[PDB]
């Protein structure tokens, strides 16, 4: 399958992602490393991602998330849930069982299987920030471990977040690496130390 672009693109509205500061304690279920541009999270736990713009985009603007393999030799392979987790009875009534990435708590989420590339993606309407806030937050879930055999099989993935108009044309793009693992704080601390050394 052809490979979606991963080029960071702020666009006319100054679109970019943001992450909370969660730390590396034993209790953390989701933690973001700015040094690695990498999110570490437990299976099917809430991953809050902030969405920032300098200017308000038009009504009908949408936000899409899609995963690709990071390594060049695997980028053409569609990222999907492994044979075990795709058969889990963990449906929410909206997400197809094969999709790695879900949006939590948005009844207007739409899930696409692309007719030409076969890649999966989930898209929601882009909303203005709430009354007390300066950004919008979307909650994602990753429904397979990075280590799952017959799925990601220990290969790193990127999540690509695209801001789109009502036809799906590109308005902005950002991305981050993801590891889905049982000990996200410990793995973050280790991978950050490897980078320093
Ligand atoms: C999405 N959509 C709108 Cl209208 C706004 C505003 N204001 N912000 C987002 C998140 C990038
Ligand atoms: Zn799995």
Curated annotation (Swiss-Prot):
Changing residue 65 to D: In sporadic cancers; somatic mutation. Changing residue 40 to C: In sporadic cancers; somatic mutation. Changing residue 186 to K: In a familial cancer not matching LFS; germline mutation and in sporadic cancers; somatic mutation; no effect on interaction with CCAR2. Changing residue 110 to D: In sporadic cancers; somatic mutation. Changing residue 151 to S: In LFS; germline mutation and in sporadic cancers; somatic mutation. Changing residue 161 to M: In sporadic cancers; somatic mutation. Changing residue 82 to F: In sporadic cancers; somatic mutation. Changing residue 183 to G: In sporadic cancers; somatic mutation. Changing residue 77 to K: In sporadic cancers; somatic mutation. Changing residue 69 to N: In sporadic cancers; somatic mutation. Changing residue 19 to I: In a sporadic cancer; somatic mutation. Changing residue 112 to F: In a sporadic cancer; somatic mutation. Changing residue 139 to Q: In sporadic cancers; somatic mutation. Changing residue 124 to E: In sporadic cancers; somatic mutation. Changing residue 94 to V: In sporadic cancers; somatic mutation. Changing residue 88 to S: In sporadic cancers; somatic mutation. The N-terminal and C-terminal disordered regions undergo liquid-liquid phase separation (LLPS) following homotetramerization and activation. Post-translational modifications, such as phosphorylation or lactylation affect the ability to undergo LLPS. This is Cellular tumor antigen p53. The lineage of its organism: Eukaryota, Metazoa, Chordata, Craniata, Vertebrata. The chain holds residues 95 to 291 of 393 of the full protein.
């Amino acid at each position: 399958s052809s490979v979606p672009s991963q080029k960071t693109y702020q666009g006319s509205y100054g679109f970019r992602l943001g992450f909370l500061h969660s730390g590396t304690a034993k209790s953390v279920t989701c933690t973001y490393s700015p040094a690695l541009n990498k999110l570490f999270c437990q299976l099917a736990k809430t991953c809050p991602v902030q969405l920032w713009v300098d200017s308000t985009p038009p009504p009908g603007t949408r936000v899409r998330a899609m995963a690709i393999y990071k390594q060049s030799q695997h980028m053409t392979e569609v990222v999907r849930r492994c044979p075990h987790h795709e058969r889990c009875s963990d449906s929410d009534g909206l997400a197809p069982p094969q999709h790695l990435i879900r949006v939590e708590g948005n009844l207007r989420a739409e899930y696409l299987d692309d007719r030409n590339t076969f890649r999966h993606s989930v898209v929601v309407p882009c909303e203005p920030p709430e009354v007390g806030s300066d950004c919008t937050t979307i909650h994602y879930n990753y429904m397979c471990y990075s280590s799952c055999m017959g799925g990601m099989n220990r290969r790193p993935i990127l999540t690509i977040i695209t801001l789109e108009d009502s036809s799906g044309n590109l308005l902005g793009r950002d991305s981050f690496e993801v590891r889905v693992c049982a000990c996200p704080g410990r793995d973050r601390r280790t991978e950050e130390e490897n980078l320093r050394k």
